[PDB]
Amino acid sequence: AWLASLKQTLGLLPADRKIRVLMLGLDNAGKTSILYRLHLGDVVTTNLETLQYKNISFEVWDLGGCYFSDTDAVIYVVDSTDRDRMGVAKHELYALLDEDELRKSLLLIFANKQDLPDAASEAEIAEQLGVSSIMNRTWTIVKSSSKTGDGLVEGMDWLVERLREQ
Amino acid sequence: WLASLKQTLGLLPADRKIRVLMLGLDNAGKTSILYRLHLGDVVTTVPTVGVNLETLQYKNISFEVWDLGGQTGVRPYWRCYFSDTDAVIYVVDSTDRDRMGVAKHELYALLDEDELRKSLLLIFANKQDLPDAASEAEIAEQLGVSSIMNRTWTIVKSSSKTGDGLVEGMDWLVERLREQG
Ligand SMILES: Nc1nc2c(ncn2[C@@H]2O[C@H](COP(=O)(O)OP(=O)(O)O)[C@@H](O)[C@H]2O)c(=O)[nH]1
Ligand SMILES: Nc1nc2c(ncn2[C@@H]2O[C@H](COP(=O)(O)OP(=O)(O)O)[C@@H](O)[C@H]2O)c(=O)[nH]1
Ligand SMILES: [Mg+2]
Ligand SMILES: [Mg+2]
């Protein structure tokens, strides 16, 4: 669907200018699946998963079960099906954004698992994550699905063009 | 030295987690000290591309080892990595006079970190089993220890071949920790 592949998209970032992206969310949000769905190389476990591609680093841990310096973006992943864990996803998101080391990070939310029938819309997610009153930072929500692969490149294209803009 | 190592280390307040960094140039004997301590498994991880980090965890006390003063590469770095350090044990190979100025240089570049403000500093003048090992006062002079500031520090002669001085060192650290009340 999207007009360019992911590698063309990420191709656009200054071929060197190290990019650090934290992709965080509650367990079962679908973060390991997106890492895999990106088809960018393999995931290193260390608990923590990292995917390095050219200049760009992706680091993943689960929330709600220092490290934040020099972060260019936060990808926040939510399971759009999981109604009653979504208030906890909101809390953990708010915990992240009160971090001083993160004050200039872009925020991309993936409203995820949008292939499923129970899947809230972007406005239900923005309302639930109470994003719609975050006005001190550049953010968006994009509907996504690791089972399709849908939303993912759009979301990364968002990040790439916001990163170049600065 | 009187006590065994375990006895020495048991003296530490159990509900106080202790982070130690054991650092210095390659070939100082760092890895060998971790095995010579007979405290259990040495675990290797890679917290960043191009860094071999060895960790030995015993009760509340953790030892971290990586090599400094690579001729190639920037100084090994990763996020945090100096945060909540209780002590640094700086290990020198007491026979490597040739590299002793570089060992000073890397000691000095550790000591200018605030994350390492009030760390205890134990210097192990290591490999003393070897007849060509420099004196304790000779080491002090070559590491320019007289310019060291604002820290509880000492130099202890040590060897992994014989195990000598190690308990002395751990005991120094252990009691200095407690002196902090
Ligand atoms: N329907 C659907 N299921 C997904 C999707 N992504 C992940 N899953 C399933 O969600 C569960 C949690 O996924 P995982 O990637 O390990 O989440 P993690 O805890 O954030 O690392 C697994 O059963 C996945 O198969 C998705 O996009 N759509
Ligand atoms: N003679 C002697 N050799 C030592 C001593 N400690 C380590 N070695 C040896 O010195 C070399 C490197 O020691 P090692 O523990 O790998 O140093 P590291 O590079 O700081 O981790 C190897 O040949 C070790 O077996 C020691 O106390 N006396
Ligand atoms: Mg996972
Ligand atoms: Mg070693």
Considering only CB atoms, A67 lies closest to which of B45, B46, B80, namely B80
Strands B53-58 and B43-45: antiparallel
Tokens in use for A60?
């993943």
* Angstrom distance (rounded) from CA A47 to CA A76: 17
Q: Are A50 and A60 in contact (CB under 8 A)?
A: yes
d(CA B114, CA B166): 27
Domain, as residue range, for A3: 1-166
Residues 6+ apart with CB under 8 A from A82: A26, A28, A29, A89
Q: Are strands A49-53 and A56-60 parallel, antiparallel or unpaired?
A: antiparallel
Q: What phi and psi values does residue A64 have, to the nearest 5 degrees?
A: 70, 25
**Largest distance between two CA atoms of chain B:** 43
CB-CB contact of A110 with A142 (8 Å) = yes
Which sign does the torsion angle of CA A61, A83, A87, A77 carry? positive
Ligand 2 centroid to residue B94 C-alpha, Å: 11
Reading the block at residue B42, the tokens are 């040495």
Residue B139 to residue B135: CA distance in whole angstroms: 6
Q: Which whole-number Å values give the CA distances from B1 to A101, B18, B147, B155, B166, in the listed order?
A: 48, 23, 30, 16, 9
Q: What is the 3-state secondary structure (H, E, C) of A81-118?
A: CCHHHHHHHHHHHHHHHCCHHHCCCEEEEEEECCCCCC
Which residues lie closer than 8 Å to B48 by C-beta, 6 or more apart?
Answer: B76, B77, B78
Chain B CB contacts of A69 under 8 Å are: 79
Q: What is the CATH number of the domain that holds A43?
A: 3.40.50.300
**CA A17 – CA A54 distance, rounded (Å):** 10
Q: How far apart are CA B164 and CA B1, in angstroms?
A: 8
Q: Does A69 touch chain B (CB under 8 A)?
A: yes
Please confirm, yes or no, whether B71 is among the known catalytic residues.
Answer: yes
Closest CA–CA distance from residue A67 to any residue of chain B (Å): 6
Taking the C-alpha atoms of residue A110 and residue A142, their distance in angstroms, rounded to an integer, is 5
H or E stretch at B44? strand B43-45
Contact between A105 and A71 under an 8 Å Cβ cutoff? The reply is yes
DSSP assignment string, B98-120 = TTHHHHHHHHHHHHT-GGGTT-E
Query: Are the beta carbons of B90 and B121 closer than 8 angstroms?
Result: yes
Q: Where are the beta strands (DSSP E) in B30-140?
A: 43-45, 53-58, 61-68, 87-93, 120-126
Of B81, B83, B69, B65, the residue nearest B23 (C-alpha)? B65
Copy the structure tokens of residue B133: 């090992």
CA B31 – CA B48 distance, rounded (Å)? 19
**Is the minimum CB–CB distance between A46 and chain B shorter than 8 Å?**
yes
- Note the resolution in Å, 1 decimal: 2.1
The structural domain count of chain A equals: 1
Helix ranges (DSSP H) in chain A? 6-11, 31-37, 86-97, 122-128, 152-165
Cβ contact B104:B123 at 8 Å: no
Pocket probe for ligand 2: among B51, B160, B164, B166, the residue whose CB has the most ligand atoms within 8 Å is B160
Rounded-to-integer distance, Cα A45 and Cα A60, Å = 9
Q: Are the C-beta atoms of residues B103 and B69 closer than 8 Å to each other?
A: yes
Hey, is A143 helix, strand or coil?
Answer: strand
User: Is residue A37 a contact partner of residue A149, using CB atoms and an 8 Å limit?
Assistant: yes
Query: Which phi and psi angles does B137 have, rounded to 5°?
Result: -75, -30
Does an H or E element contain B33, and which? helix B30-36
Q: What is the greatest pairwise CA distance in chain A?
A: 42
Strand-strand pairing, B120-126 and A73-79: unpaired
What DSSP character marks residue A36?
H
CA B111, distance to chain mean position in Å, is 13
After which residues, if any, is chain A broken (C to N > 2.5 Å)? 46, 65
B37: its two tokens: 């301590």
Torsion of CA A28, A33, A35, A37, to 10 degrees: -150
- Phi, psi of B155, rounded to the nearest 5 degrees: -115, 130
